[PDB]
Amino acid sequence: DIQMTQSPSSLSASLGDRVTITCRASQTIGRFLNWYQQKPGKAPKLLIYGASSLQIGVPSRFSGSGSGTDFTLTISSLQPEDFATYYCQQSYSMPPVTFGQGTRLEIKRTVAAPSVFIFPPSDEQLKSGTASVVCLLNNFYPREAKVQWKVDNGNSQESVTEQDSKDSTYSLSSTLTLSKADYEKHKVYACEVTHQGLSSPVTKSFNRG
Amino acid sequence: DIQMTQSPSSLSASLGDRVTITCRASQTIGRFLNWYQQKPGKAPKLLIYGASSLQIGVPSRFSGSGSGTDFTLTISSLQPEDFATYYCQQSYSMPPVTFGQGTRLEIKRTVAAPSVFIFPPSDEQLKSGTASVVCLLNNFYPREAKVQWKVDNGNSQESVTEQDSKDSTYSLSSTLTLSKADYEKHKVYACEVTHQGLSSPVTKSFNRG
Amino acid sequence: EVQLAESGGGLVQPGGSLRLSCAASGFTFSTYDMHWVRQVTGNGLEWVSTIGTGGDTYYSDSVKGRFTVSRENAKNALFLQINGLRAGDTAVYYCARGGSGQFWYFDLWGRGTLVTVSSASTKGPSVFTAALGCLVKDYFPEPVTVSWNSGALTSGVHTFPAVLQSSGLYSLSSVVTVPSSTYICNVNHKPSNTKVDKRVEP
Amino acid sequence: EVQLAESGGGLVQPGGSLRLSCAASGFTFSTYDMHWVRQVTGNGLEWVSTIGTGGDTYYSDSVKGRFTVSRENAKNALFLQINGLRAGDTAVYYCARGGSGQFWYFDLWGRGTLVTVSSASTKGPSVFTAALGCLVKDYFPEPVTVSWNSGALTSGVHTFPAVLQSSGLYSLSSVVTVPSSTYICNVNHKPSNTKVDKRVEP
Amino acid sequence: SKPSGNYNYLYRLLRKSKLKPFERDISTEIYQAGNKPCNGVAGPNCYSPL
Structure with missing residues (x-):
């Protein structure tokens, strides 16, 4: 029954910056709250338990604060090993324990525009069943971008990779789903691009013969 | 003779934020300076004495810094019990001791807009020649709401309540004071409102009841 | 425990004699200096006087x-x-104690007392989804707050601090939330020993 | 070292019986409570069940x-x-241990197991300076990755996470960069035990 | 097992002023309601009982 409201979905900061992960409760829970750290490549691990105590093995740069209805996980100096996902859990009512929606910690850098590319399906997909048209946004830091699809100026879920440490940017891929060999059914297939600091072409289409 | 110049009268910050209350002196006073905390609901209390020594019983989040001509009271993590008024005092010239003008610590949130309402009183005051007209500004986050009065499109002292513990907003009340024969001479009145978020409500006309 | 008492604050005619009192407890009073600091309404602290050991x-x-x-x-x-x-x-005067050391600093504070110097006197005040309220005129410094419907109302109730008047009196304003898709403002003036009320029904 | 084992998680028909297993090591298991927490793909942690001492x-x-x-x-x-x-x-279900104290907190975590409920089965996928990519359809959860140049090109290859399809299968949109002042994109599938490949040119 | 019911179970629907925890109340004879509390009895404009 008790619900938790954590910080926004993502927090952007550079190395050594100070991040205060805020997480509020739906009611007074006192100090029955604990935090966790989960890297997407491994199992989760706790950092602060009881909102005042520090777990053994955690560096002193982490610090827990807040009580009652508002809790704040304050980090002093961000290290490359600290960038991960965090969650807050309430422990006032033991059986119905709930967790926060999560908070992402990403490395801050300049606004990198994506290399917007689009490729048509090969002849193999046309010989096969339902064809598809894919759109590509590669190497961009503002992950808040999102790609849609339009027909002649059945959308599918987009896919985003992790932040590559080589450029501290993200890569996004979105595709449009159609019926059997519908690539010859229309002359225009519009990819809807939208990115910060970019022209954001609402209809990026091919030009068939 | 020695004068003190503290930080602005009000400082806005949220829980866990870092606040550095700056207070400067008129000349070199060395380290003969002390800080005090005063909640408007109780008596004052000292936090830093000698600008380097922490008072026993004060949490380690408070820290005093600066010497000679510039002093800075640095707070690491704001708590609900930390939001209060602070004063700096010099101790170099002990008989002519002087205190600072004060600095208010308020909770930071979104910029709320005052719900401007106006209503006339009962006929009990209209029976007397000294009628009145009130102009209400309730539930707004800031406090610097400048309200005046315009006759036919007198002024009096306004009243502001303390910041709410849940809404974190202030409420303002201004009243129009009419002297003898002024209630019967002038019929049209106007409340002058100036606050962030509104479309310059310099005139809010009203008719005598 | 350790605390400082205070008594003697009150109204006095301009130029009249007045004597405040402060009583310490919980420490060796004969080995610490005492200070007197006042604070005007809306202003900061102001050192008045002190006496050494x-x-x-x-x-x-x-x-x-x-x-x-x-x-x-x-x-x-x-x-x-x-x-x-x-x-x-x-x-507003405060009783303060001088802590140990080589410089003046107030390590202990008292309860604090209020001193008002004026020639005025206590006078009975007059009281006069939507949001409205009652207006009070000719008020006086009071020890109890104003409530609506004897405080039993659970709706939005607010009370603004008083404002100074030319004759030395005060004036208070209060607001309330009523359904407009009716309560009684109770102004229980203690120093006047008389209660006054009004209604704001639509 | 102290760690928690896990086994039994896998594909299962809707409503079919399934049994998970967890094995502790490195501590007194009889004096600690155990908790079961799941995590949906793209979602946070969610407590499922627990058992005390x-x-x-x-x-x-x-x-x-x-x-x-x-x-x-x-x-x-x-x-x-x-x-x-x-x-x-x-x-994704994780085996967790309840630490000693007065409130429930997870001090030890296991490797975690994956549980997927679907009626579909494994199906062989088909493979479909400039940058290009080969679209993959009808995929399945696999323990391997995508490659290029028949498996010889893996440095400049990016593989996006898969997305679920209506037929109970996945899809991939891996891309690569080739000089154009053209290589065979090879897709290996361990659960299918069959390799498929194609190529695209600028 | 009472298809008829209609009694032997009651609950209060007023007095939300303070309601301190674990403080029960049994007095339900008459309470202030309306302009006049029906001279101390139940009826119209005085449905104060639970």
Whole structure:
């Protein structure tokens, strides 16, 4: 029954910056709250338990604060090993324990525009069943971008990779789903691009013969 | 003779934020300076004495810094019990001791807009020649709401309540004071409102009841 | 425990004699210095006077010449006699103790007392989804707050601090939330020993 | 080192019976409580069930009635009987230990197991300066990655996470960069035990 | 097992002023309601009982 409201979905900061992960409760829970750290490549691990105590093995740069209805996980100096996902859990009512929606910690850098590319399906997909048209946004830091699809100026879920440490940017891929060999059914297939600091072409289409 | 110049009268910050209350002196006073905390609901209390020594019983989040001509009271993590008024005092010239003008610590949130309402009183005051007209500004986050009065499109002292513990907003009340024969001479009145978020409500006309 | 008592604050005619009192408890009073700091309504702290362990007295620039601080080593009794008060002397006084060391700093504070210097007197006030309320005129410094419907109402109730009047009186304003898709404002003026109320029904 | 084992998670028909297993090592297992927490793909952690030292069991609202947690004091064996599964229960389950104290906190975590509820089966996927990519359709959860140049090009290759399809299968949109002042994109599939490849040119 | 019911079970629906925890109340004879509390009895404009 008790619900938790954590910080926004993502927090952007550079190395050594100070991040205060805020997480509020739906009611007074006192100090029955604990935090966790989960890297997407491994199992989760706790950092602060009881909102005042520090777990053994955690560096002193982490610090827990807040009580009652508002809790704040304050980090002093961000290290490359600290960038991960965090969650807050309430422990006032033991059986119905709930967790926060999560908070992402990403490395801050300049606004990198994506290399917007689009490729048509090969002849193999046309010989096969339902064809598809894919759109590509590669190497961009503002992950808040999102790609849609339009027909002649059945959308599918987009896919985003992790932040590559080589450029501290993200890569996004979105595709449009159609019926059997519908690539010859229309002359225009519009990819809807939208990115910060970019022209954001609402209809990026091919030009068939 | 020695004068003190503290930080602005009000400082806005949220829980866990870092606040550095700056207070400067008129000349070199060395380290003969002390800080005090005063909640408007109780008596004052000292936090830093000698600008380097922490008072026993004060949490380690408070820290005093600066010497000679510039002093800075640095707070690491704001708590609900930390939001209060602070004063700096010099101790170099002990008989002519002087205190600072004060600095208010308020909770930071979104910029709320005052719900401007106006209503006339009962006929009990209209029976007397000294009628009145009130102009209400309730539930707004800031406090610097400048309200005046315009006759036919007198002024009096306004009243502001303390910041709410849940809404974190202030409420303002201004009243129009009419002297003898002024209630019967002038019929049209106007409340002058100036606050962030509104479309310059310099005139809010009203008719005598 | 350790605390400082206070008594003697009240209304006095301009220029009349006044004597405050402060009583310490919980420590060796005969080995610590005492200080007096006032605070005008809306203003900051202002040092008034102090007395050392050896009985020596000190006052401020606008304080010396009319004030008289005294202190007894026994009974933990501290006093502050004032004469020739004026309207500008209205402030909240506090009893403070001088801590150990080589510089003046207030390590202990008292309960604090209010002193008002004026020639006025207590006078009975007159009381006069939507949001409205009652208006009070000709008020007076009061020890109890204004409530709506004897405080039993659970709706939005607010009360603004009083404002100064020309004749020395006050004026208070209160607001309330009523359904408009009716309550009684109870102004129980304690110093007047008379209660007044009004209604704001639509 | 102190660690928690896990096994039994895998594909299962909707409503089919499923039994999970967890094995502790490196500590006194009889004096610590165990908890079961799941995590849906793209979602956060969600407590499922737990069992205390005294053998008492507890479950969640959407969990009670179909789950059954069991634990044996010997062999450090922990189990979680699951029945009546549905598509909404697809999540990554983690074996966690309850630390000593007065409140429930997870001080030790296991490797975690994946449980997917679907009626589909494994199906062979088809493969479909400038940058280009080969679209993949009809995929399946696999322990390998995509490559290029028949498996020889893996440095400049990017593989996006898969997305679920209506037929109970996945899809991939891996891309690569080739000089154009053209190589065979090879897709290996371990659960299918069959390799498929194609190529695209600028 | 009472298809008829209609009694032997009651609950209060007023007095939300303070309601301190674990403080029960049995007095349900008459309470202030409306302009006049029906001279101390139940009826119209005085449905104060639970």
